[PDB]
Design a protein around this motif. Structure first.
Motif, mmCIF file in Angstrom:
data_model
loop_
_atom_site.group_PDB
_atom_site.id
_atom_site.type_symbol
_atom_site.label_atom_id
_atom_site.label_comp_id
_atom_site.label_asym_id
_atom_site.label_seq_id
_atom_site.Cartn_x
_atom_site.Cartn_y
_atom_site.Cartn_z
ATOM 1 N N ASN A 145 2.456 1.707 -3.434
ATOM 2 C CA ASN A 145 1.527 2.292 -4.399
ATOM 3 C C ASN A 145 1.338 3.786 -4.159
ATOM 4 O O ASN A 145 1.332 4.580 -5.111
ATOM 5 N N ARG A 146 1.182 4.188 -2.893
ATOM 6 C CA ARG A 146 1.030 5.608 -2.588
ATOM 7 C C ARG A 146 2.278 6.391 -2.979
ATOM 8 O O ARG A 146 2.184 7.499 -3.520
ATOM 9 N N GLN A 147 3.456 5.820 -2.721
ATOM 10 C CA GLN A 147 4.708 6.448 -3.122
ATOM 11 C C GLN A 147 4.795 6.600 -4.634
ATOM 12 O O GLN A 147 5.273 7.621 -5.131
ATOM 13 N N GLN A 148 4.352 5.589 -5.386
ATOM 14 C CA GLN A 148 4.372 5.711 -6.842
ATOM 15 C C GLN A 148 3.414 6.795 -7.322
ATOM 16 O O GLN A 148 3.739 7.556 -8.243
ATOM 17 N N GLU A 149 2.230 6.883 -6.709
ATOM 18 C CA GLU A 149 1.302 7.956 -7.062
ATOM 19 C C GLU A 149 1.910 9.321 -6.763
ATOM 20 O O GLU A 149 1.776 10.263 -7.556
ATOM 21 N N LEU A 150 2.591 9.442 -5.621
ATOM 22 C CA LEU A 150 3.270 10.692 -5.301
ATOM 23 C C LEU A 150 4.402 10.979 -6.279
ATOM 24 O O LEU A 150 4.637 12.138 -6.617
ATOM 25 N N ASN A 151 5.111 9.945 -6.738
ATOM 26 C CA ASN A 151 6.145 10.142 -7.748
ATOM 27 C C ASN A 151 5.547 10.695 -9.034
ATOM 28 O O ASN A 151 6.092 11.633 -9.627
ATOM 29 N N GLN A 179 0.824 -1.206 0.000
ATOM 30 C CA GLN A 179 0.000 0.000 0.000
ATOM 31 C C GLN A 179 0.860 1.259 0.000
ATOM 32 O O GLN A 179 0.601 2.201 -0.763
ATOM 33 N N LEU A 180 1.901 1.284 0.837
ATOM 34 C CA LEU A 180 2.813 2.420 0.855
ATOM 35 C C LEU A 180 3.594 2.529 -0.445
ATOM 36 O O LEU A 180 3.868 3.642 -0.904
#
Lengths: 36, 28, 53
Positions: free
Chosen positions: C9-15, C6-7
């Motif tokens: 995926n969130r990190q990739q969205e933030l990237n 989950q983290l």
């Protein structure tokens, strides 16, 4: 003048149709450029 | 003898209208 | 390990959002120069000179 105003209206409408599809366009281009 | 000047018009529906008024006359 | 993915995926969205980042500034018209000078206004200067005289 009629042709000029028609062209102005068409350009404005086509830009807004494109402007509506803009934020996603850059996101998708970077996603395409980022696929390993 | 003065050259006649005709006027044409059009009507646009906006789905505001001040930023669009400014953007229509933009150089782009 | 689910929170790990989950983290990620969130990190990739933030990237993605950091890399794109469409800012609040969209330069509609790049700067252009009017070829007609704004000063001095010759006609009003001459009229003022004549009236003053």
């Amino acid at each position: 003048i009629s042709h000029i105003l028609d062209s102005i209206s068409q350009n404005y409408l086509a830009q807004n149709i494109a402007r509506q599809a803009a934020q996603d366009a850059k996101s998708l281009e970077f996603l395409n450029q980022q696929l390993p | 003898l003065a050259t006649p000047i005709y006027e044409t018009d059009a009507l646009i529906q906006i789905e505001q209208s001040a930023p669009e008024t400014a953007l229509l006359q933009s150089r782009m | 390990r689910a929170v790990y993915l989950q983290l990620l995926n969130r990190q990739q969205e933030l990237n993605i959002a950091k890399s794109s980042a469409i800012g609040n500034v969209r330069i509609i018209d790049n700067a252009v120069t009017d070829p007609n000078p704004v000063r001095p206004k010759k006609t009003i200067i001459i009229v003022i000179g004549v009236v003053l005289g």
